[PDB]
Amino acid sequence: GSWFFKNLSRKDAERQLLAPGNTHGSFLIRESESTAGSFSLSVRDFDQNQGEVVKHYKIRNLDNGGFYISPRITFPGLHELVRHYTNASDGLCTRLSR
C-alpha cells in the first residue's frame, strides 16, 4: 500500500523521497525485484554537513518469518515494524512520518 513498494530500486526510491512534498521522516519500504522477501527502508532526513538526504536501512529476516533492523528489537511483521519506528526513532536517524 502507500508505504510499501515492490521492485523499486535504490535510486528510484531516492528520487521519489527527495521530491517536494516530502519531509524529514517521509519514508517507504521497498522489496527487491531480484530477491523476493528482501526489504529495505528508505527515509528522508537532514544531514548537518550534507543537507537533505535519503538514508537506507536493511531489514533482516528471522527464521520464524519475522523482521528487525536492529537485533535489539524484532517484529512479527512489517506493520508492527512501522508502528514502532513511527512512535520512537529507537536507533534510526529520525522517526518516520506518514
Binding site: 538514508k55 537506507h56 536501512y57 536493511k58 533492523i69 536492529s70 536507533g91 534510526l92
Partner: peptide
C-alpha cells in the same frame, strides 16, 4: 554490502 546505514 549495498551500503546500508549502521544501527546500534
Amino acid at each position: 554490502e549495498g551500503d546500508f546505514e549502521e544501527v546500534l
